């Protein structure tokens with residue numbers, strides 16, 4: 001479903017601390033409650049020397065903020081990664097300047113809109129209107145139905161509480 | 162993909178302690194390693210008074226046996242439940258005598274064989290040849306590619322170590 005990817009991505013560069021400024025899904029159910037499936041908060045991006053992508057995040061599970069560790073396996077396309085799991089899901093980097101923001105999404109193969117969510121990652125706990133612009137632009141086509149956004153205070157909180 | 166379900170199921174009855182005697186998937190990848198997605202060990206079945214199905218299990222995550230809690234939502238069909246998550250997955254009870262064994266499976270909608278795994282649940286840490294018969298019978302049609310089985314000793318171990 002996602003048609004924009006970042007040309008000439010340097011995945012090494014995207015390493016470090018990240019803030020999930022905003023999130024969007026094609027289904028309200030994926031983001032509605034705090035225990036919603038794709039409602040995850042990114043701690044840091046950790047690209048492996050063989051070009052894989054270790055992702056650190058938090059996610060509410062059974063009344064508690066629990067840090068999680070996911071691994072995105074590199075594919076032929078530099079901006080597309082596969083999360084080693086059921087139903088196979090892709091991780092697409094849409095766009096990034098490495099030092100300010102990063103836009104990427106997650107779509108479940110064989111069923112886009114019935115599985116798809118995007119985030120706007122920023123380096124600091126500052127809201128970046130510039131980045132939000134790019135994020136909305138990119139999503140302007142996508143069939144999104146829920147949209148979230150956090151404030152500097154929630155961003156310094158675990159699970160953006 | 163799964164075509165046999167248990168007529169006249171009394172989900173209340175299946176409550177209690179359960180042993181994952183054996184497991185099978187349509188994909189070796191779902192069960193191969195200990196961190197394999199559908200490689201989960203069931204602790205106990207807990208059916209809710211409104212007829213939902215709370216499931217307690219263990220599952221290896223990042224070099225550690227971690228207890229997990231999943232919830233299967235009742236559907237129009239008494240033996241079919243839906244696990245509240247991405248890609249929507251069904252939980253089907255194939256057959257049970259409530260006090261000896263329980264056969265159920267998990268298939269991911271819109272893609273059977275590219276997502277499907279079954280277990281043979283027993284009440285005691287004893288291997289039940291009778292039950293294994295039924296489990297193999299039921300799977301005899303299904304396009305399974307990996308098959309596991311545990312021993313009383315592994316069954317009294319967390320994560321059947």
Ligand SMILES: CC1=C(/C=C/C(C)=C/C=C/C(C)=C/CO)C(C)(C)CCC1
Pocket residue numbers: 038039040055057059068070083091104105106117118119
């Ligand atoms: C949606 C989303 C992401 C996916 C996260 C997943 C699939 C988390 C799974 C967590 C677990 C272990 C859940 C089971 O309890 C990634 C970071 C790819 C990119 C940004 C959007």
Ligand SMILES: CC1=C(/C=C/C(C)=C/C=C/C(C)=C/CO)C(C)(C)CCC1
Pocket residue numbers: 199200201216218220229231244252265266267278279280
């Ligand atoms: C295969 C299988 C089961 C499914 C388990 C699942 C889907 C576990 C998910 C765990 C998490 C939270 C993983 C993310 O890290 C159930 C008990 C339905 C029935 C027996 C076969």
